[PDB]
Amino acid sequence: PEEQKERKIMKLLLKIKNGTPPMRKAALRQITDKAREFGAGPLFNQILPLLMSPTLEDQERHLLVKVIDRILYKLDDLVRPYVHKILVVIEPLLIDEDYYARVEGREIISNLAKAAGLATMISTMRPDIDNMDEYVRNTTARAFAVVASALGIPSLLPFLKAVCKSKKSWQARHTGIKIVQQIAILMGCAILPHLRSLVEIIEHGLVDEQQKVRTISALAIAALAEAATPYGIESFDSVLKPLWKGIRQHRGKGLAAFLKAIGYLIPLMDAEYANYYTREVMLILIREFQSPDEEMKKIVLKVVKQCCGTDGVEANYIKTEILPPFFKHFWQHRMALDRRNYRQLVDTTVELANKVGAAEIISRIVDDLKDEAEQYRKMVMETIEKIMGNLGAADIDHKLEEQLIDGILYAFQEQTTEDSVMLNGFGTVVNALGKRVKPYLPQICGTVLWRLNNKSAKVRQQAADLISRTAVVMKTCQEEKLMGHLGVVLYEYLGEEYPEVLGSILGALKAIVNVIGMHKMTPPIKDLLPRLTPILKNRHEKVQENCIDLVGRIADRGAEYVSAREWMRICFELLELLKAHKKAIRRATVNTFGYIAKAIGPHDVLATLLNNLKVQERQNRVCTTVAIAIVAETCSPFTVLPALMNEYRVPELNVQNGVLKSLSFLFEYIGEMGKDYIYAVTPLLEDALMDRDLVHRQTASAVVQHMSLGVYGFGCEDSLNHLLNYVWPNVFETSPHVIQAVMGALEGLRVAIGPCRMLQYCLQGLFHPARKVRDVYWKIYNSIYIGSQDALIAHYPRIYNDDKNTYIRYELDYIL
């Protein structure tokens, strides 16, 4: 029988299941064209039990839903008689704690009901909305959400009207209400074309007798608000009142969800409504400020943020109305103990601060700096820090700022975790106290110093950190005793052996020396830097970073204080930082070679760099060649070019290549500046482009590339023409590196010299007798064409027209 046969040949789902990706291509293509002729008749019965098989995997599911959707697009009609079957076997997936079961059932049902018939759907799944089981009601309701995804709400909305206006069953009114909230979850923005039709659907049950329907409808309000935020400035008064009354004449998860939903209604309202509505809802809020519930807390606090954050309600309103119960019931240990409440309580309390100031909020959360759950005072400084950092320290008065600074000190000592929490709190709080902090610098430091004395490393390290934070304001005190303190006491801790603390100590010393210059530093740098030199041997990325930073500052500014001989020894030590395994170190090393060339003259450091070029192993040769480029950039290139060029004569490879690579970087650093040394360097590149070796011409070509890109636009085009004459012959080459550097030289030279000159070099060998030469010229002309295909329009030759074609361009020789 042809039907059993069609299924037989149809099981090339084996071709797609097992097999090569060739197998996949053969079968996928054949069926994607046979999707009519094969049909869905045999498919669906082969197909449903694999899609329901217990361990078909993520991408098996992905591929099979690919199949179902595209074959259902294909066979809009040729899938017809299997609708209730697909329906009921996939249905529980939309109402299912796997978001992706929801998603995938949703998408395939979208396409199913889409290329299918709505009639069948309605027919089968009307009588199930009235059913007795909330299980089946939820499953069919989230199904209906997926079916609206598949077809569109419009075709359905009156039948929704029915399933929601039913006077037989409350079961079915609850069902329709959750269908509502479900689409409100799924399609999201896609509702505003209706935007009130569903609101009409739901107006019936927030007053209903069954708490189930009432409160799921509250949550429907929540979900619709959520998808219905921002855009939606129009129609909304036609339902404002059932919301209003159910808010109080209701109880449940729905009410907190509805508070978030009416948060969307507090942003979208006007005074004579957003005064009465808010003012009314605030007493709801005051009774909910003690709500244990989590998503309650979320919804009510989000609400409050927008609600008591409008211009409808005066500061007085909140300060006498919201704050007392709000602070009372949310400023218990429970909320900081909570993982959600910590941050969200923060959010809304910072916003109420933004609303009504600091001289009351700060006062209401002062002594939570001395509570028990260190998490708590941690939270309160998290807030306070955010608050004063955004707003300023001007609002806080005297006694307030006192108790604040003191609770701060406590939090930081009491610290028992390795966290940036209390650090950032401190940094922000003094960052905002600005100049308010003068009189407690004895207090603040004395604390930090006693900590710096501790046995266990961790607290020592912490105190070093805290110094590195407040370092700048330590200045704004003008604390003679106190900034002097931090200076000498950190000179003490310079003996640490925990790299993690030593690095931060170096950071704090640097950030002190920035404010207070060298010649009034508390340890005179005359004793500091001698102490620092034995640290440069600490073979650790963070302490090394900060140490070389500090020594670079000093050698820049102090320069004359240190002696030439010291700088020379330090040069010789840098020469073997160029082999660290971390690249930050090596870039810092090169920079300081630059600074030393500025302080001392360039010539001795350049002599010590060439001798390093003689080393082998490449990555310290390459980094000394960077350093040479840098020395030349700072102290003008005429000082170094003769020595480089002359060193190009020592007969060794690694060094001739070092010279060439260094000129590369130099012209890149110089850029336009190379417009000076281009003439000096040409006769050396022409020298090395007339053969000396493969690598000789590879390297001279790289140099030409970088010179050209530097001297773009400064007129030194005669020199690059001259060097084209010498580079272009290497065009026929084979070695990959050699021909590659040649091609690079020709792109650089293309921007710098223009595309006429290079199209002329490329003219004659486009159509030449050999295929090796045809191919190289078409490679070049391709790269000349891709970049700057639009200049060439005025550079093409004149190519006469034979009999049956026209080839001249008369457009271009109209006279005028």
Q: For the segment 785-804, give every residue that binds other proteins (CB under 8 A).
A: 785-800, 804
Q: Please, what is the minimum distance in Å from the beta carbon of residue 732 to other proteins?
A: 5
Q: For the segment 326-355, give every residue that binds other proteins (CB under 8 A).
A: none
Helix axes 253-265, 240-249, angle to 10 degrees: 140
CB 68 within 8 A of CB 111: yes
Structure-token pair, residue 44: 């669906």
Q: For the segment 26-55, give every residue that binds other proteins (CB under 8 A).
A: none
Structure-token pair, residue 540: 């650790």
Q: For the segment 146-185, give every residue that binds other proteins (CB under 8 A).
A: none
Candidate segments 5-13, 44-52, 423-431, 666-674, binder of other proteins by CB under 8 A: 666-674
Contact between 774 and other proteins by CB under 8 A: the answer reads: yes
Q: For the segment 703-732, give every residue that binds other proteins (CB under 8 A).
A: 706, 709, 712-715, 717, 728-732
Please state, in angstroms and rounded to a whole number, the distance separating the CA atoms of residues 460 and 454: 6
CA 216 to chain CA centroid, nearest Å: 38
Q: Which of 390, 514, 646, 760 binds other proteins (CB under 8 A)?
A: 760
Candidate segments 308-316, 358-366, 396-404, 688-696, binder of other proteins by CB under 8 A: 688-696
Contact between 691 and other proteins by CB under 8 A: the answer reads: yes
Q: Which of 668, 676, 686, 687 binds other proteins (CB under 8 A)?
A: 668
Number of residues that bind other proteins (CB under 8 A): 91
Q: Please, what is the minimum distance in Å from the beta carbon of residue 208 to other proteins?
A: 33
Q: How many CB atoms lie within 10 A of CB 259?
A: 30
Q: Residue 645: is it exposed, middle or buried by C-beta count within 10 angstroms (0-12/13-18/19+)?
A: middle
Contact between 683 and other proteins by CB under 8 A: the answer reads: no
Give the residue carrying structure tokens 């260190």.
Answer: 374
Contact between 747 and other proteins by CB under 8 A: the answer reads: yes
> Counting every residue, how long is the chain?
816
Name which of 335 and 762 has its Cβ closer to other proteins: 762
CA dihedral (777, 780, 786, 787) positive or negative: negative
Q: Please, what is the minimum distance in Å from the beta carbon of residue 174 to other proteins?
A: 30
Contact between 814 and other proteins by CB under 8 A: the answer reads: yes
Candidate segments 298-306, 475-483, 498-506, 749-757, binder of other proteins by CB under 8 A: 749-757
CB 485 within 8 A of CB 529: no
Find, among 741, 709, 738, 704, the residue nearest to 721 by Cα: 704
Contact between 57 and other proteins by CB under 8 A: the answer reads: no
Structure-token pair, residue 251: 């109880």
Q: For the segment 490-549, give every residue that binds other proteins (CB under 8 A).
A: none
Q: Please, what is the minimum distance in Å from the beta carbon of residue 115 to other proteins?
A: 13
> What 3 state SS string does 484-541 have?
HHHHHHHHHHCCCCCHHHHHHHHHHHHHHHHHCCHHHCCCCHHHHHHHHHHHCCCCCH
Please state, in angstroms and rounded to a whole number, the distance separating the CA atoms of residues 202 and 196: 10
Q: Sort residue 230 into left (φ over 0), alpha (ψ -120 to 50) or beta.
A: left
Contact between 196 and other proteins by CB under 8 A: the answer reads: no
CB 378 within 8 A of CB 344: no
Structure-token pair, residue 431: 């960052």
Contact between 248 and other proteins by CB under 8 A: the answer reads: no
Contact between 425 and other proteins by CB under 8 A: the answer reads: no
Q: Please, what is the minimum distance in Å from the beta carbon of residue 636 to other proteins?
A: 14
Structure-token pair, residue 796: 């093409």
Q: Sort residue 579 into left (φ over 0), alpha (ψ -120 to 50) or beta.
A: alpha
Structure-token pair, residue 612: 């390093």
Contact between 690 and other proteins by CB under 8 A: the answer reads: yes
Name which of 117 and 744 has its Cβ closer to other proteins: 744
Please state, in angstroms and rounded to a whole number, the distance separating the CA atoms of residues 148 and 153: 5
Letter for the amino acid at 371?
Answer: D
Name which of 138 and 730 has its Cβ closer to other proteins: 730
- What string marks each residue from 207 to 246 as x (binds other proteins by CB under 8 A) or -? -----------------------xx---------------
Q: Which of 69, 128, 288, 368 binds other proteins (CB under 8 A)?
A: 69
Largest CA distance in the chain: 103
Name which of 440 and 667 has its Cβ closer to other proteins: 667
Q: Please, what is the minimum distance in Å from the beta carbon of residue 397 to other proteins?
A: 35
Q: What are the φ and ψ backbone dihedral angles of 163, each rounded to 5 degrees? A: -65, -15
Contact between 805 and other proteins by CB under 8 A: the answer reads: yes
Q: Which of 94, 733, 741, 745 binds other proteins (CB under 8 A)?
A: 733
Q: Please, what is the minimum distance in Å from the beta carbon of residue 733 to other proteins?
A: 7
Structure-token pair, residue 207: 């007053």
Find, among 263, 310, 267, the residue nearest to 285 by Cα: 263
Find, among 649, 747, 732, 734, the residue nearest to 696 by Cα: 649
Q: Which of 193, 392, 495, 530 binds other proteins (CB under 8 A)?
A: 193
Q: Which of 43, 261, 626, 631 binds other proteins (CB under 8 A)?
A: 626
Q: How many CB atoms lie within 10 A of CB 672?
A: 12
Q: For the segment 445-474, give every residue that binds other proteins (CB under 8 A).
A: none
Name which of 569 and 692 has its Cβ closer to other proteins: 692
Candidate segments 516-524, 549-557, 558-566, 750-758, binder of other proteins by CB under 8 A: 750-758
Contact between 748 and other proteins by CB under 8 A: the answer reads: yes
Q: Which of 493, 697, 703, 719 binds other proteins (CB under 8 A)?
A: 697
Contact between 811 and other proteins by CB under 8 A: the answer reads: yes
CB 89 within 8 A of CB 48: yes
Candidate segments 245-253, 288-296, 369-377, 808-816, binder of other proteins by CB under 8 A: 808-816
Q: Please, what is the minimum distance in Å from the beta carbon of residue 231 to other proteins?
A: 4
Q: Please, what is the minimum distance in Å from the beta carbon of residue 811 to other proteins?
A: 8
Name which of 218 and 759 has its Cβ closer to other proteins: 759
Q: For the segment 583-612, give every residue that binds other proteins (CB under 8 A).
A: 583, 586-587
Please state, in angstroms and rounded to a whole number, the distance separating the CA atoms of residues 613 and 693: 20
DSSP classification of residue 198:
H
Contact between 25 and other proteins by CB under 8 A: the answer reads: no
Contact between 17 and other proteins by CB under 8 A: the answer reads: no
Q: Please, what is the minimum distance in Å from the beta carbon of residue 751 to other proteins?
A: 6
Name which of 132 and 793 has its Cβ closer to other proteins: 793
Please state, in angstroms and rounded to a whole number, the distance separating the CA atoms of residues 377 and 410: 9
CB 170 within 8 A of CB 213: yes
Q: Residue 3: is it exposed, middle or buried by C-beta count within 10 angstroms (0-12/13-18/19+)?
A: exposed
Please state, in angstroms and rounded to a whole number, the distance separating the CA atoms of residues 604 and 625: 16
Contact between 102 and other proteins by CB under 8 A: the answer reads: no
Q: Please, what is the minimum distance in Å from the beta carbon of residue 346 to other proteins?
A: 19
Contact between 661 and other proteins by CB under 8 A: the answer reads: no
